[PDB]
Design a protein around this ligand. Sequence first.
Ligand SMILES: O=C(O)C1=C[C@H](O)[C@H](O)[C@H](O[C@H]2[C@H](O)[C@H](O)[C@H](O[C@H]3[C@H](O)[C@H](O)[C@@H](O)O[C@@H]3C(=O)O)O[C@@H]2C(=O)O)O1
Ligand SMILES: [Ca+2]
Length: 490
Amino acid sequence: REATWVTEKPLTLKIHMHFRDKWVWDENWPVAREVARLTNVKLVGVANRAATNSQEQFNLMMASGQLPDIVGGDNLKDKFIRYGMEGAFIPLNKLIDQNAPNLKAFFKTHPEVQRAITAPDGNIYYLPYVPDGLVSRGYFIRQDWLDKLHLKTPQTVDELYTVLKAFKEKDPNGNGKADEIPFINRDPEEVFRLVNFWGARSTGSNTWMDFYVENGKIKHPFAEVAFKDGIKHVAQWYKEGLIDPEIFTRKARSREQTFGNNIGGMTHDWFASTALFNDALSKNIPGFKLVPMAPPINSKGQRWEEDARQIPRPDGWAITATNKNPVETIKLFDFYFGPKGRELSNFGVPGLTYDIKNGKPVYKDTVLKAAQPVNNQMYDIGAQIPIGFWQDYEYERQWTNDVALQGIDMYIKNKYVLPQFTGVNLTVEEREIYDKYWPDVKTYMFEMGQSWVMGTKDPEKTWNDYQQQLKNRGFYQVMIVMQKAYDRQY
Ligand SMILES: O=C(O)C1=C[C@H](O)[C@H](O)[C@H](O[C@H]2[C@H](O)[C@H](O)[C@H](O[C@H]3[C@H](O)[C@H](O)[C@@H](O)O[C@@H]3C(=O)O)O[C@@H]2C(=O)O)O1
Ligand SMILES: [Ca+2]
């Protein structure tokens, strides 16, 4: 028996959690085993580890008969609310009040977080991933390539064009081949964010393709004329090879590939793990120097950083109506919001990845000095995963090197980050419209965006058909409920 047990008799529950298009819940994970030991509840995964689309696996789950006990993963907020309101997920409000003292206290001190996860019917259908921190991404460029080519740090988009074209054409890696790829990115959606250079938004928050507000009016980035004109410019840089030809396909290991083989020039990504490549690659590429850059002055005369940490994220886990142990389940979930649960869910396992020293969790040198970023190392053992959990920025500070710190400090000091969208409070009827049309409109928008970047559709010529399709697919119906909600509120 342990003081932390949430049941005297051992309990096993089934969880469907497929996440990040790459991972599933693993009961053999060190963190899972530790939580199961401390709480007496073991979670067994039932998701398909061979699939590469987490959203489609949610959908396949929901269509494969009786639900498991718990469902978790990234980018599931809207599915948890839509299916909660229908009954597939249960409201957690009273379970929390009666049985989850850590969460009850957390929500009292984080009313914004409780607001963000509550549905139009007043119910909480999931517990979120709660990030910790302020900035997330920033621009990084190869200083050593700038110096090889005698180029200054670009300050405007026109200066940046010249620098990326030089990276492409002037052989900065010195191997006689035109193998350099000026701009790379782990995230396909960052290609859409390049429209910021031409004064257009791509998303209002860390959630991809989110709405934004301008002067009191709700807008969607992909519907705006500025997006049509901006995406033309992105398509031109893609045509000319300044953007990775594989930007929609290469994905998670883009940095390992392109910086590791000295062919990537620039990216837009999270400060800590991106700056770590200076340290990981120092033996193999002695003068490798990837450094933060201020955003270039864009066509609207401003230096935009569109992204920031979003507290909470639309990620987490929920209790299904078939779970026969909802009270033991909410107690298990509450364990993660207590001190020990929070330590494990962030740092891994004591004696394995960290030690308590002077009362604080301190990562081992083998973790801090490893070639893989520490968050990647955490995923592999079941930490830093998008369950309901409260991230602790102290985990990240320990592997935030001086290059990263000086980039984060620059961005915070100079206020590049744009105000983020914090959502609206829909009514039940407005929510019906949103759930009926929005998910499919966002899919269509992405498809058209990819077509525009790769040049298989010309944005100027297809823009009218596209706007008629937005109307036909319900987009303006959603825009109007969003605006009504905004107005009602504000
Ligand atoms: O890399 C960092 O320096 C960094 C520090 C923070 O502590 C987080 O660990 C942060 O993690 C983010 C990842 O870098 C990456 O952007 C990840 O993207 C996910 C996305 O959120 C979503 O789950 C889905 O689309 O899959 C993406 C992916 O992993 O394939 O988001 C992480 C985050 O915690 O938001 O990185
Ligand atoms: Ca070369």
